[PDB]
């Protein structure tokens, strides 16, 4: 089985406690690290940090300690846009120039792959060819990935890709069954299903449905959707959320799951973001409620006019199980810095979560 852990070069930035640096990661806690998120600068490939360099260095300097450890670079992200993704998969000299600078880079900094993380393909702004030249894109890495393995003299550098859950996404921008054969793992992001972007108060990440395209917004109907069309369950992995999505209720008397909302909820002290919260955010809230929905056996919690979505230690062990069931590749986790990284908060010790997971596979 495969643990994949995120690791968000933002983090650093989150104040006291939460701040996040590379030494604050557990080399044996995973068994792949991915590091979010690279950039692009005139089709190669590029830091986006002042101290990227140096957060590498550390980052895969860990596998000195853990040889086993594999390590990837994802490049894109949701503020990155996908603009620059079209213009460098557009022709094919500039793929190349990509292709050849992610080697060049992945190398000099001992990454062991790619992790591509276009949000998204053929779609929110990107043409409709995209969708084709997406998997061209992964085409000629795995087939450069393929020869730069007899040169070297290392091992194959890996490929994946992080993927959305709903079907109009998938339509949009992949082929299912044809990247599934270049990608060495498919990172399947199981979770923000239901956010402050909605009237009605939902939970971030359901395994089951509560009718309509509606019942489709879960875990389950993400995982079903994306092995009926190809994807051999060993290459899928089980996204997992170390973070809630919140809600301010309209009224604090009606905190039922559908219960309208005016809009996101109080940003939380450290992730200072309205709609989402770390799980050491959540986990210790004093004088809250805190239930479960039965039908999508994750929890939720509220206190005054605030609600909350998010996933704890019995949710994840339900979910391993599920994934057991479905014979999946494993899990997946976003992010290294949501969950309780150092016991500070939580009194759980050091990654309640993602330990839980490491645990159960």
Not at 324 to 336: H, I, P, R, T
Not at 338 to 359: E, H
Request: include cysteine; hydrophobic fraction near 35%; glycine fraction near 8%.
């Amino acid at each position: 089985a495969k643990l994949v852990c995120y690791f968000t070069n933002w983090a650093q930035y989150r104040q006291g406690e939460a701040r996040f640096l590379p030494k604050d990661l557990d080399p044996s806690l995973c068994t792949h690290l991915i590091y979010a998120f690279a950039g692009m600068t005139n089709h190669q490939l590029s830091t986006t940090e002042w101290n990227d360099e140096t957060l590498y260095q550390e980052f895969n300097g860990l596998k000195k300690m853990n040889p086993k450890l594999k390590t990837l670079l994802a490049i894109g992200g949701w503020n990155f846009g996908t603009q620059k993704f079209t213009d460098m998969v557009a022709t094919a000299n500039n793929r190349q120039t990509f292709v050849n600078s992610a080697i060049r880079f992945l190398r000099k900094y001992s990454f062991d792959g790619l992790d591509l993380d276009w949000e998204y393909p053929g779609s929110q702004g990107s043409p409709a060819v995209d969708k084709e030249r997406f998997t061209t894109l992964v085409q000629d890495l795995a087939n450069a990935f393929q020869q730069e393995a007899q040169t070297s003299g290392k091992e194959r550098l890996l490929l994946s890709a992080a993927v959305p859950a709903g079907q109009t996404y998938v339509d949009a921008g992949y082929e299912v069954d044809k990247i599934a054969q270049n990608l060495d793992f498919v990172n399947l992001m199981a979770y923000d299903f239901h956010g402050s972007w909605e009237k009605v108060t939902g939970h971030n990440s359901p395994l089951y449905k509560r009718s309509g395209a509606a019942a489709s917004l879960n875990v389950d109907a993400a995982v079903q959707q994306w092995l009926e069309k190809g994807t051999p369950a060993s290459k899928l992995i089980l996204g997992m959320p170390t973070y809630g999505r919140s809600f301010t209720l309209a009224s604090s008397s009606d905190t039922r799951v559908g219960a309208p909302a005016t809009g996101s909820g109080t940003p939380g002290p450290f992730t200072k973001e309205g709609g989402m919260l770390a799980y050491y955010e959540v986990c210790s809230w004093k004088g809250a409620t805190k239930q479960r929905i039965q039908d999508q056996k994750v929890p939720y919690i509220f206190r005054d006019n605030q609600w909350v979505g998010f996933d704890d230690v019995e949710s994840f062990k339900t979910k391993v199980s599920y994934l057991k069931q479905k014979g999946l590749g494993g899990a997946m986790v976003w992010a290294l810095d949501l969950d309780d990284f150092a016991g500070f908060s939580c009194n759980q010790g050091r990654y309640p979560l993602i330990q839980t997971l490491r645990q159960e596979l």
